[PDB]
Symmetry: D2
Subunit: 488 residues, 4 copies
Amino acid sequence: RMAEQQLYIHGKFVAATSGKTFETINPATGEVLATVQAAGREDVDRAVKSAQQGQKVWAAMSAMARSRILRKAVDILRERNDELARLETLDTGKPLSETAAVDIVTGADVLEYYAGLIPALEGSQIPLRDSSFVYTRREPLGVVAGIGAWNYPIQIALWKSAPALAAGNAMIFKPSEVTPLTALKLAEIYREAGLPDGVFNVLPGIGAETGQYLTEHPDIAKISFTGGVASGKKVMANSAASSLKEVTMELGGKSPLIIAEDANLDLAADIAMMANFYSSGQVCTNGTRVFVPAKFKAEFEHKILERVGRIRAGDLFADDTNFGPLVSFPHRQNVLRYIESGKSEGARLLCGGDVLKGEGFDNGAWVAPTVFTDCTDDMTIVREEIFGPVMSILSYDDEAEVIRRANATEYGLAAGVVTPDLNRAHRIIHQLEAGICWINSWGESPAEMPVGGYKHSGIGRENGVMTLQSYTQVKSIQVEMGPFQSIF
Amino acid sequence: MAEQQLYIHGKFVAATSGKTFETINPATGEVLATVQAAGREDVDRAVKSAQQGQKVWAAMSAMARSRILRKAVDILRERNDELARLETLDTGKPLSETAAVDIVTGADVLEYYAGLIPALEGSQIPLRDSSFVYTRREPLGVVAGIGAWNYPIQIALWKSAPALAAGNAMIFKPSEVTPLTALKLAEIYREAGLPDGVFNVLPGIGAETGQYLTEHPDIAKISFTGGVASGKKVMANSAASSLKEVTMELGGKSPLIIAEDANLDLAADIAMMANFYSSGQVCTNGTRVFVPAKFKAEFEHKILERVGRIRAGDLFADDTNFGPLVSFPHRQNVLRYIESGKSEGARLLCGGDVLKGEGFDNGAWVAPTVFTDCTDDMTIVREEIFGPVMSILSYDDEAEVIRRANATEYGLAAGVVTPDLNRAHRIIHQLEAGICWINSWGESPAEMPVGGYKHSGIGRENGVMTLQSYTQVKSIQVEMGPFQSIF
Amino acid sequence: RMAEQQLYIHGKFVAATSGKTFETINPATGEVLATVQAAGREDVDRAVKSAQQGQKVWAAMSAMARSRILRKAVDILRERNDELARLETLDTGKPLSETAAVDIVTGADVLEYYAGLIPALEGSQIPLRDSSFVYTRREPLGVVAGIGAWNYPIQIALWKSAPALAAGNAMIFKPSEVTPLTALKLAEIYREAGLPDGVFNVLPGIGAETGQYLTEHPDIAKISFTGGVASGKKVMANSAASSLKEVTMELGGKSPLIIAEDANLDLAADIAMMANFYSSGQVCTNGTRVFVPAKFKAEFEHKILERVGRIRAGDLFADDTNFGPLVSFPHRQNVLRYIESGKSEGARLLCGGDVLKGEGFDNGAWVAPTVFTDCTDDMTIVREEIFGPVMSILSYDDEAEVIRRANATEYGLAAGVVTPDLNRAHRIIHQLEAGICWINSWGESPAEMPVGGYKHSGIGRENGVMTLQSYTQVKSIQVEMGPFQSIF
Amino acid sequence: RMAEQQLYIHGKFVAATSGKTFETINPATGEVLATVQAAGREDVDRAVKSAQQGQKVWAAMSAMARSRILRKAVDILRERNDELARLETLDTGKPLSETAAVDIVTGADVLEYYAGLIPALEGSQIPLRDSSFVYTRREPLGVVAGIGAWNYPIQIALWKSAPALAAGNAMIFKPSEVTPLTALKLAEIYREAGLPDGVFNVLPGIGAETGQYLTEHPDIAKISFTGGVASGKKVMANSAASSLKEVTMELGGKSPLIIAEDANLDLAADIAMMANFYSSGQVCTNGTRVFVPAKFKAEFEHKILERVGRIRAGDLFADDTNFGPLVSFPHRQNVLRYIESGKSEGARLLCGGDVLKGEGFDNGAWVAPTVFTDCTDDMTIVREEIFGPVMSILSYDDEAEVIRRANATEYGLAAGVVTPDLNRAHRIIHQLEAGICWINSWGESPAEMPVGGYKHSGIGRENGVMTLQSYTQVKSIQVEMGPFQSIF
Ligand SMILES: Nc1nc2c(ncn2[C@@H]2O[C@H](COP(=O)(O)O)[C@@H](O)[C@H]2O)c(=O)[nH]1
Ligand SMILES: Nc1nc2c(ncn2[C@@H]2O[C@H](COP(=O)(O)O)[C@@H](O)[C@H]2O)c(=O)[nH]1
Ligand SMILES: Nc1nc2c(ncn2[C@@H]2O[C@H](COP(=O)(O)O)[C@@H](O)[C@H]2O)c(=O)[nH]1
Ligand SMILES: [Cl-]
Ligand SMILES: [Cl-]
């Protein structure tokens, strides 16, 4: 077993003063991975004052000095990629085949990206007249808070802290109570790279206490939240009631995958598989509404079933395992409730629909890869994000119809189209009300590419140059060199 | 005047609320007009009208949109005086202000954004020979603006100009105190060729019409200007309902720092313009004036001399430069703060009472008021008054004044008066405010982003960035290589 | 006959002091349109001193004051579009069906575009440390010169003067001696719009004198030239040798049009026609090397023959005329020599190849629309810009081959591909060495879109936000607020 | 002495086929440092073909892969700083106190800066209408050539190669024949960092042969030149006559230092010293015209004499040496000619004016720190760049006068003002016709700050984000999804 996990405040581990702890479970076995201390209201106050002190040191350094420190953190993350991925697999249940290739690789890609952009962060200068001009400064916000989710723990920590730190802020990061372990490791790595004490503090805890204490704190200038749509609305409200914080939200979706009448169905089946069953379906951007032309539906169903049969659940550290248990046993219960609603509302179950059983599965939170067909737009499984391995296949007749049905949702995160035709690909994508659109692919999220939701799926964006800027605030300065005229 | 209706889809329409309210002329106490209030059903009609207009509007070319907004600018320039007189009647601000500032600078911002529409561009990012990303800056759709009463038509233009320029339709709710010019603007936009529904105006009260807007599920963004308390309610309800993007321009308690090397005639002029324009009803006003102790007595003399030249009177008279407050309930709140200053030991330098006599007894007048000997714990020093109440505070050294200038939950504006190169930039760089003026006050060019730090605001208005903030980024990856599935 | 045309200097017409004149001819009839004064060395020096004085007034105005004046000029151009187009047709020989729909419309579009961008022209601000920061100004160059070509006289005058003026400069414009008339009209329009005197001066003359005097003048900060590749090299040399001027050059090309194996051949033929025979083939961006798959070549040739048979030469003011004479008898002589070279080098003449004869044609320099096929990469007509209505059709077998052959040229101006396939369209275009690339279209040049040549086809760009910036020069300013340390 | 120095082509040293060599002299002793092979016409052609091959590999890599390789070159340069600085001191005669603190540090600072910006290099996307859009690519130019100067050999090589490589190009670099050695070392360092073979080739040689072969080559797309005004005009002409290359030129200046009437004269004297005597006056940006108010002139002259007496010439490797010989004996002869010109025209010699003599100086190309006063705007030493340690002090009476005199020159490189007054500093700087402006300082050139000349002092800029973009060329691509309409 691991040692009791403490808070990370001001460059060292420190005991919480809340007197409270929680446990994180290994979802493959049900065993306790670690007991974790929970940050109380006073621990949060201590973290903010640590962050205020560190942020001043960090911002006073030169831009290239900050760049070099983050680059050293990148180097450590590349060296420790396999070790960090193994820890992430234990905490999340995701196969090592995923965590060692994606989670830290792409988290570090984003930190590496923003490290190089720090010196390009510039204000503007605006001439008004010969005797007066304006210039702007992109100043740090100060202390910002990141609230992470459990499906990509260290990647989310990196995607939130990289731009925040790169812009000259300190960040207090609260990982999900489900998956707190890699965030604490990241804090140690940042310190090892030379990040000033206090610039990245980590506070494990539960949302109702530690999360709320951060969102309410008067000296936190911005909150960045990743999680479910409902919890997001609550976070965003509480941030306004306290001190009118800036907000960023990356929430869930019900993203449509549109298969065009001229699509190759093997390619379409491969994209739908990767859009539904990666990380056991626990991805906010998953293409869980798969729209297929009626004339191709039966053949598409056959190709999905063939690929589903190739899914390899088992030992999460085995090279050939590509499917894991869900992150927790309560989450499995929620996915199973959705599956039962699909059955009772008349969707046709093509495969899966139950837990996995037998040696090596009975103690883990496993759900079989599940595919429903003959789905309709009013069904619960079609309208609501499930966050488990459940694909809904929907038939359609014409392009105008599928665009309307694709857009007829409160969600807005991602979308995609499969077509070899130039006009159809751009024409359709331009009409879809989603922030992340994939043509003949799914899932790739380059550090350069801003990502976030339309409508109820988000506020603001992550990644790209714009996100570095969104972690600064503009100060406009007018220099008046002419004589000032008063009307009094 | 005739009973004022809602403006929905290019025409005046009766409200379905069965409710009305009155707007009072603050100079006479008389009712200017009865105004229909938009109910929950009216808001839904406005949204559906806005959805229809926005699609027509967004389908036009960028230059087609530019030309239509430019035509609205031409109409606003022509009707500057007519609109200003209506603004004066509704707000109590002197015609000397409304005819020179309110429509002029409102139109300036609309004109600025009209020209930037064709420059609104996405990006393209190569990943590898076989895949690239490009982005679109798409309209949000239907957005809502909630205006304040101190600059009714200017606020309406500063919100609607970037929103319309970005391809959105806007539903605008003016303050119930000052609803009249927003309705005039709606007619002007239509006359310019704005498609029906792209700018709808829904007068009403904040507790009903404003709340219905913040709650509507099909509104993508709310832009609010007003007080801090009302703002927190707006931003909460916008999140609880449909997770709207939000922009907030709130009040402040902005510091004016007079340096030890400042010319005191210049410093006094800046302090005057920072406190008594629009009778002190300006969000950015420099209501905490920090003066070095060694010059405090002389500065107080120079302020008193200039206060003596203030000309209250007929708001349509050329030489009038001071008006009544926007309403009698607001005057009562301002008087509550003034009495707080007296009881907490601040020294009254001038004013502090209502104005009396022929032509003033019927208006909501408060005399220009100056407190000195102020300390950082006083209520008048800590809280926004939004009336003509200057607070003068003494200081000894530069480090102190910076700490005290920043020791506030507000973050809107700030300024320094000094002829020294290093001092001006050095001090300004350390102040926690979004709008900083050196050797001046109040100028807000269309090019210059403005908004608050800390409790004074969220987001910005004006400048290129605000046009972008009325769009949403769509990222599109083109994968020309063979897609690899691990299953 | 028109009245004698004078120089335009400092807001009024003025006699040249050179004592020299030239005539501009109506290319449809041979009649003298007007006698035109030629600017001498002293006239250029007067124009520069006028421009220097006007530029200071212009640059001192507010940004929106400049914007409003250029917009008034736009409004005048819209109102007089048909009158100016008729003058352009008389001077150039291009059909009114073209000049009234393109030349002034698109010239004014660019002026309107830049008029609106003036307030967005901004510098930068760069923090170095707490005690020092840098800011930049985008200052006007001062006095710049534009040298126009004869195929699009007023359009070029607008595309050069609009960004130059919007950036705060004065421009001295030298129109082609072939086509000086609309530039003089534009100068009056600017003044009527409120442009300060001296900000746009126009100096007709011949290239060997007036053009050379401008390129040599020591107080002209930049030369922008449109013309042939050969003449361009001469101008760029003289500008460097005299005073080290900044330079922009829009030269000719031999642009490839690649027809993919999956293209609809009616669409491909329509694009090829528009890419070769608009303005009687006198267009720098024309797609004069048409690459067609071997298996479709015969059918494509038939479709070209059918469309060529529809070309309607005749009265240039008639609605149905869509083909005009070449601008002059010397230019037709050169085109005729290229046609004869094609015949003698073994290319197969598909149609045309001769002068037009008979009533209405004997007085103009008309050449029949000409198409050569069976062309090979070594032929003179394939390698060299003809600037007449001469299409070369080349067969190809595979995609790698056609990209190689398309790129095997010193020219670099434009290119295009015809294909409905998403991957093919972007994949091919990304490999073509040209600045202006069209997918399933040809010729459109939006004000927003920077256009210019690779390799020998140009230096710099016109249109787009970047061209406004390129008519400014960057000044960097460091404010050092810390104590300066000397090592001596 | 060193072994015969070879060319660097395609990742290795290779013997030249020209049969020609030249020698580089140690300016402190007159000894031959090394015999160096000169690249011939055939050698330039091999280098270009090597560069074309390397550039294709380099450009095909990911952006972050290119960033990492340039960052490894940075790390090696930091490590080998002292070794490289000693070599630079031997080759240039600049004191080790300079070369070890400035030359490699600031060269590497720029490489490090551009390494981080590679992922931020983005094109644009422009919607035209629902059925058509434009997007742009910032493509590499291909093979570019940089031609270096002798005063900052490795710094110039880094400032040219860093943006060029970061933008995806290969560069062929020709160092000055006076100082060829550190460029060859840089070529090895790049390869050691993982730069693909051919991406950075170094061709020592003379300007009239090797330099000309580069400017003439048809497959080099851009020339970047740093040197004198005269040779620049020659280079820019030959580049146009051959293949219409893009050009950047960083030439000399006669930059003014304006001392305001409210300036502290100790600060002004310190700024004037650093603006004139660093690198023994061999800096293009030097403030060689020092304008002082008449009322302060006598006191300022005394303060200059005091500080000139503190200059410590001697052993270039001694810690306390801060002044060196000139780069070569022929260059000293030209500097002496300028000094005699000052005497013959009646300028008053305040100090210096002769060679240094005695043990340790008789064998080196030493010139004493020289200050002329009572200078006027028509004097040769005032009008012409000397590129030696020669300060000219000019009296003035009022602000308008000094701005006019500061600007009355063909040069435009730098300028500066000394004043504590807010309005005066910005007011004056905004009116000066120079690209590089310093307030209350001199000489600092941050990687973020674009630098280059107005008027005859240059074309284009170096450093800053704009210089990364200027090493790409814009390709505009229109996607037309609507039906194309032909008028034929
Ligand atoms: N998008 C998203 N949804 C989540 C996440 N965690 C839980 N959910 C969703 O929220 C609900 C349960 O959340 P809980 O109340 O257990 O935190 C379920 O609908 C579940 O799918 C998360 O990290 N991201
Ligand atoms: N690209 C281009 N070529 C031109 C232009 N004017 C003339 N030429 C070319 O120059 C040659 C003869 O014209 P000249 O410039 O000698 O009068 C021919 O090759 C002709 O096509 C022009 O404006 N653009
Ligand atoms: N600005 C500048 N001038 C130079 C440079 N090298 C030589 N010069 C100047 O050019 C002239 C000729 O010197 P040369 O080029 O033959 O060494 C002299 O006035 C010399 O000072 C250089 O690298 N930069
Ligand atoms: Cl491990
Ligand atoms: Cl009236």
